[PDB]
C-alpha cells in the first residue's frame, strides 16, 4: 500500500474544492399578508448560494411555501379598536381632531404589539414544525427577512394613522423574542403598504414565475437578432378577487398604441424586475369595493334602495336562491343548521363597515373633495348621516331571493362593473386611466392568456363543474358559463332534517347551503360580466383558466398564487441591492 498517498492527494483537492467553490445554504423568508379579511403569515424557504468574491444570492426557482399561517385580526381592527378607545366611541360620525391622537402613539404600539406577538409565535410554530435540526441551524444563522404588506383592507384608511402604524410594526418585527433563535428583521422597503397596482403586478409575477413562463435563462428566454431579451412563452395575465379589492393585470402585446391617459407600467423602467429579465409593458389596475366582502355589502345597499327591487319592505334579490330569505342588512350572514339565515348586527362584522367608514363627512377625503362625496352618495351612502344610518338599508325588513341569474348579471353590471360614477376610494385606478372594470378592456386589451384567481371565483366555477353543468375542460366560453349559472341559480332552497339544501332544477341533484355558497351566484354574475367585457376587447385573451396553485416541476405546487411570491421576487431578484440589505446590513443592523 502506497495508496495511503493517493488518499492524501485527494484530501488536499477535497479541501481545495471546498474553499474555491460556492456553498449552498437554506434561508427562511416571511411574507405577512395584512389583507382586508385578516393578518396572516406565509413562511417560505429558499436556497441561497455564496461564492468566493461574489457574495450571496437566492435561487429564485427554489422559493417554496412551507406554511400558511392562522388568520388573525386585520390591521383595520387594530386601528379602529385604537380609535374607539382614544378618539371615543363612534368617531365615525363626529369631527375628530387628528392632531390629538398623537399623544396616544404609545398605546397604538401596545395594541399592535398584541397582534405581532401572535404572528411571531405563529411563524415560529410553522418553522419549528417544518424544519429538521440541520435545516434549523442554517435558517437561524442567515437571518429571516420579513415582508409585511397591507392591501385593500387599510388602503382607504384616513388621516396619518396607517403609516404611523407601519413605523411601529417595523420596530416590532425588528425586536423578535430572543428565546426561539430565529432572527427576524425588516426595513421600510420590505414592510409597507402596497399599492393596488403593485398588488396586481406581484400577483402577475408570481403566476408567471410558478408556471415557469418568466425567467432569465435560455429555457425561458431568447435574445433576439436585435439584442432584446424575449420570453419564449407568452406571459399570462391575472385576475385576483380578494376580500375588499380585485386586481386585473395583463401584459400588452408589443407595440400596442395606448391612449395618452392609459398609464401602463414597464417592468424594467419601473424597477419591478431587473434588467436581465425580459421586459413588458403591463396594465395593472385594482378596484376597491370589488372584493367578495366589499362587493357583497355595496351590492345589497344599491340593489335594495332601488325601486325595481324594494317594494313595501321586501327586497327581491336576483342573486339569491328562491326560498332563501334573510334580514335586511349588510351584516355578516350565518346560515344556521335549522336553515334560517342569521345576520350579525355588530357593526364591525358588517360588510359595509369599510365603505361606510371611508364615506364619513368627517373624513377630509370627503369633507374637502366633493367628487368623493358624489361617489359615496351614488352608492347610497350619505356622508352626513351617522354610521349606523349610513349602513342601514332604508325601508327594508327582509331580503327574499328570486333566483334570476340574468337580472343578477345586469345588476352586477350597472352597480359594480360599469357604474355611473367610479366606486369610492379608487383614485389610484382612475389615475391609471381606469374608473370602472368596464373601461379596462375598452381602453387596453391583450391577447395574453388570463388566469382567474381567488377563493370565491374558483368556488363559482367548481360548483358548476361539480354538478356537471360545466365541462371539466371549461375553456372560458361566456355563453356556456351563463347557461350553467342560469340553471344553477334557478335552484330552490329546501329545508330538510339534515339542514338547508340547494335543490337543482330537473331533478339534477343537490348540495348543502352554507355561509360561503349562499350568494355565490353573485360571483357567477361578476365572472360572466367580466368575461363579456374581455370578449368585447379589441384583442381577446388567447385562453382563460381558473387556478389556485401551479404544479411545481416535482408535480406538487411550490407555493400559492397571490402577491406573496411576487414581492419576494421583486426584492431578491436585484441581487446586489438584496445582498446589501439582507446579508450585509441583515439583522445585525438592529443593535
Ligand X SMILES: Nc1ncnc2c1ncn2[C@@H]1O[C@H](COP(=O)(O)OP(=O)(O)NP(=O)(O)O)[C@@H](O)[C@H]1O
Alpha helices in 24-104 (DSSP H): 75-87
Binding of ligand X by 292 (CB under 6 A): yes
Grid cell listed for 198:
403593485
As a whole number of Å, the end-to-end CA separation of the chain is: 58
User: What is the DSSP annotation of 260-298?
Assistant: TT--PEETTTTTSS-TTSPP-EEEEEEEET-SHHHHHHH
From 27, 32, 35, 191, residue interacting with Mg ion (rule: CB under 5 A): 35
Site string for ligand X, 509-528 (x = CB under 6 A): -------x------------
Nearer to a second copy, 151 or 527 (CB): 151
Binding of a second copy by 49 (CB under 8 A): yes
With CB under 6 A as the contact rule, which of the stretches 94-102, 173-181, 238-246, 319-327 interacts with ligand X?
Answer: 238-246
Binding of ligand X by 331 (CB under 6 A): no
In the complex, the smallest distance separating the C-beta of residue 311 from a second copy, rounded to whole angstroms, is: 40
Binding of ligand X by 153 (CB under 6 A): yes
From 37, 295, 380, 564, residue interacting with ligand X (rule: CB under 6 A): 37
Starting from the edge strand earliest in sequence, which strands make up the sheet with 325-327, in order?
Answer: 310-311, 313-317, 396-401, 325-327
Nearer to a second copy, 4 or 556 (CB): 4
R_g over Cα of the chain = 26
The rounded distance, in Å, linking the Cα atoms of 587 and 183 is: 6
Nearer to ligand X, 152 or 469 (CB): 152
For a second copy, the binding residues in 129-148 under the rule CB under 8 A are: 137-138, 141-142
Binding of ligand X by 352 (CB under 6 A): no
Binding of a second copy by 222 (CB under 8 A): no
List the one residue out of 200, 208, 203 whose CA is nearest residue 434: 200
For a second copy, the binding residues in 178-217 under the rule CB under 8 A are: 187-189, 193
Grid cell listed for 147:
415582508
Q: Are strands 281-288 and 265-266 parallel, antiparallel or unpaired?
A: antiparallel
In the complex, the smallest distance separating the C-beta of residue 153 from a second copy, rounded to whole angstroms, is: 13
For a second copy, the binding residues in 469-508 under the rule CB under 8 A are: none
User: Which option in Mg ion, a second copy, ligand X, none does residue 13 bind, with CB closer than 5 to 8 A by kind?
Assistant: a second copy
Binding of ligand X by 36 (CB under 6 A): yes
**Cβ atoms within 10 Å of 236's Cβ, excluding its own:** 24
Binding of a second copy by 55 (CB under 8 A): yes
From 47, 94, 136, 162, residue interacting with a second copy (rule: CB under 8 A): 162
For ligand X, the binding residues in 434-463 under the rule CB under 6 A are: 455-456, 459
The helix (run of H) or strand (run of E) holding residue 439 is: helix 437-443
Site string for a second copy, 61-100 (x = CB under 8 A): --------------------------------------xx
**Number of chain positions touching ligand X (CB under 6 A):** 18
**Cβ atoms within 10 Å of 278's Cβ, excluding its own:** 23
Please answer whether residues 211 and 165 qualify as being in contact, where contact means their C-beta atoms are separated by less than 8 angstroms: no
With CB under 8 A as the contact rule, which of the stretches 222-230, 469-477, 504-512, 524-532 interacts with a second copy?
Answer: 222-230
Alpha helices in 2-132 (DSSP H): 4-20, 75-87, 105-130
In the complex, the smallest distance separating the C-beta of residue 10 from a second copy, rounded to whole angstroms, is: 9
CA distances from residue 28 to 46, 58, 176, 194, 214 in whole angstroms, order as listed: 6, 11, 15, 22, 23
Give the DSSP letter of residue 394: T
CA distances from residue 499 to 184, 266, 337, 494, 512 in whole angstroms, order as listed: 47, 53, 5, 8, 7
- Give yes or no: 492 in active site: no
Binding of Mg ion by 193 (CB under 5 A): no
Binding of a second copy by 260 (CB under 8 A): yes
Grid cell listed for 336:
344556521
Q: What is the dihedral of CA 57, 58, 61, 63, to 10 degrees?
A: -170
User: Which option in ligand X, Mg ion, a second copy, none does residue 516 bind, with CB closer than 5 to 8 A by kind?
Assistant: ligand X
Please answer whether residues 111 and 79 qualify as being in contact, where contact means their C-beta atoms are separated by less than 8 angstroms: no
List the one residue out of 442, 452, 472, 460 whose CA is nearest residue 544: 452
Positive/negative CA dihedral, 320, 324, 327, 333:
negative
The rounded distance, in Å, linking the Cα atoms of 39 and 33 is: 6
With CB under 5 A as the contact rule, which of the stretches 8-16, 31-39, 529-537, 567-575 interacts with Mg ion?
Answer: 31-39
Binding of a second copy by 16 (CB under 8 A): yes
Which one is catalytic: 92, 120, 198, 199? Answer: 199
Binding of a second copy by 110 (CB under 8 A): no
Q: What are phi and psi of 507, to 5 degrees?
A: 45, 45
**Number of chain positions touching a second copy (CB under 8 A):** 81
From 111, 242, 403, 419, residue interacting with ligand X (rule: CB under 6 A): 242
User: Which option in ligand X, a second copy, Mg ion, none does residue 163 bind, with CB closer than 5 to 8 A by kind?
Assistant: a second copy
Binding of Mg ion by 242 (CB under 5 A): yes
User: Which option in Mg ion, a second copy, ligand X, none does residue 398 bind, with CB closer than 5 to 8 A by kind?
Assistant: none
From 30, 32, 37, 56, residue interacting with a second copy (rule: CB under 8 A): 56
From 207, 244, 355, 484, residue interacting with ligand X (rule: CB under 6 A): 244
Q: Give the residue numbers annotated as catalytic, written as ranges.
A: 199
Residues that bind ligand X (CB under 6 A): 35-38, 151-153, 242-245, 291-293, 455-456, 459, 516
Please give the residue ranges that form the binding site for Mg ion (CB under 5 A): 35, 242
Amino acid at each position: 500500500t502506497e495508496k495511503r498517498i493517493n488518499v492524501g492527494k485527494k484530501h488536499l483537492q477535497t479541501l481545495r474544492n471546498l474553499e474555491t467553490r460556492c456553498h449552498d445554504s437554506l434561508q427562511a423568508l416571511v411574507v405577512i399578508d395584512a389583507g382586508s379579511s385578516s393578518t396572516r403569515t406565509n413562511v417560505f424557504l429558499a436556497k441561497t448560494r455564496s461564492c468566493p468574491n461574489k457574495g450571496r444570492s437566492i435561487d429564485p426557482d427554489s422559493i417554496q411555501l412551507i406554511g400558511a399561517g392562522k388568520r388573525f385580526a386585520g390591521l383595520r381592527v387594530v386601528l379602529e379598536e385604537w380609535l374607539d378607545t382614544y378618539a371615543g366611541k363612534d368617531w365615525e360620525s363626529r369631527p375628530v381632531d387628528a392632531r390629538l391622537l398623537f399623544q396616544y402613539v404609545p398605546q397604538m404600539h401596545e395594541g399592535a404589539k398584541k397582534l405581532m406577538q401572535l404572528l411571531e409565535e405563529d411563524t415560529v410554530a410553522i418553522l419549528d414544525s417544518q424544519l429538521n435540526e440541520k435545516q434549523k441551524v442554517q435558517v437561524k444563522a442567515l437571518g429571516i427577512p420579513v415582508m409585511l404588506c397591507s392591501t385593500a383592507g387599510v388602503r382607504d384608511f384616513h388621516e396619518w394613522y396607517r403609516d404611523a402604524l407601519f413605523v411601529l410594526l417595523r420596530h416590532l418585527i425588528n425586536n423578535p423574542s430572543p428565546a426561539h433563535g430565529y432572527k427576524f428583521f425588516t426595513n421600510p422597503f420590505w414592510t409597507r403598504p402596497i399599492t393596488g397596482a403593485e398588488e396586481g403586478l406581484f400577483a402577475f409575477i408570481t403566476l408567471n414565475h410558478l408556471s415557469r413562463r418568466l425567467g432569465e435563462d435560455p429555457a425561458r428566454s431568447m435574445i433576439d437578432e436585435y439584442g432584446v431579451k424575449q420570453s419564449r412563452n407568452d406571459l399570462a395575465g391575472v385576475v385576483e378577487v380578494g376580500g375588499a379589492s380585485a386586481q386585473i393585470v395583463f401584459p400588452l402585446q408589443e407595440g400596442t398604441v395606448l391612449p395618452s391617459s392609459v398609464r401602463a407600467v414597464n417592468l424594467q423602467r419601473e424597477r419591478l424586475l431587473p434588467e436581465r429579465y425580459p421586459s413588458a409593458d403591463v396594465v395593472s389596475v385594482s378596484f376597491m369595493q370589488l372584493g367578495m366582502a366589499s362587493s357583497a355589502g355595496l351590492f345589497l345597499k344599491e340593489l335594495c334602495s332601488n325601486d325595481e327591487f324594494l317594494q313595501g319592505g321586501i327586497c327581491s334579490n336576483p342573486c339569491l336562491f328562491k326560498g332563501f330569505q334573510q334580514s335586511c342588512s349588510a351584516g355578516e350572514v350565518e346560515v344556521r343548521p335549522d336553515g334560517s339565515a342569521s345576520v350579525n348586527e355588530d357593526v364591525r362584522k358588517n360588510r359595509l363597515k369599510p365603505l361606510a367608514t371611508y364615506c364619513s363627512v368627517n373624513n377630509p377625503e370627503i369633507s374637502f373633495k366633493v367628487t368623493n362625496e358624489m361617489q359615496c352618495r351614488e352608492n347610497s351612502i350619505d356622508p352626513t348621516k351617522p354610521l349606523a344610518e349610513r349602513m342601514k338599508i332604508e325601508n327594508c325588513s327582509i331580503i327574499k331571493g328570486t333566483g334570476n341569474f340574468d337580472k343578477c348579471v345586469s345588476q352586477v353590471e350597472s352597480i359594480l362593473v360599469a357604474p355611473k360614477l367610479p366606486l369610492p376610494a379608487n383614485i389610484e385606478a382612475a389615475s391609471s386611466g381606469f374608473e370602472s372594470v368596464d373601461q379596462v378592456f375598452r381602453f387596453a386589451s391583450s391577447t395574453a392568456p388570463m388566469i382567474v384567481t381567488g377563493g370565491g371565483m374558483l368556488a363559482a366555477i367548481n360548483t358548476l363543474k361539480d354538478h356537471r353543468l360545466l365541462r371539466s375542460d371549461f375553456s372560458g366560453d361566456v355563453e356556456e358559463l351563463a347557461e350553467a349559472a342560469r340553471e344553477f341559480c334557478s335552484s330552490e332552497v329546501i329545508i330538510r332534517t339534515d339542514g338547508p339544501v340547494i335543490q337543482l332544477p330537473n331533478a339534477r341533484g343537490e348540495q348543502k347551503l352554507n355561509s360561503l355558497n349562499f350568494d355565490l351566484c353573485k360571483t357567477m354574475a361578476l365572472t360572466v360580466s367580466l368575461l363579456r367585457h374581455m370578449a368585447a376587447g379589441e384583442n381577446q385573451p388567447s385562453f382563460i383558466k381558473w387556478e389556485k396553485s401551479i404544479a411545481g416541476p416535482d408535480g406538487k405546487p411550490l407555493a400559492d398564487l397571490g402577491w406573496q411570491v411576487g414581492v419576494i421576487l421583486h426584492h431578491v431578484l436585484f441581487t446586489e441591492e438584496w445582498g446589501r440589505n439582507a446579508y450585509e446590513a441583515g439583522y445585525s443592523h438592529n443593535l
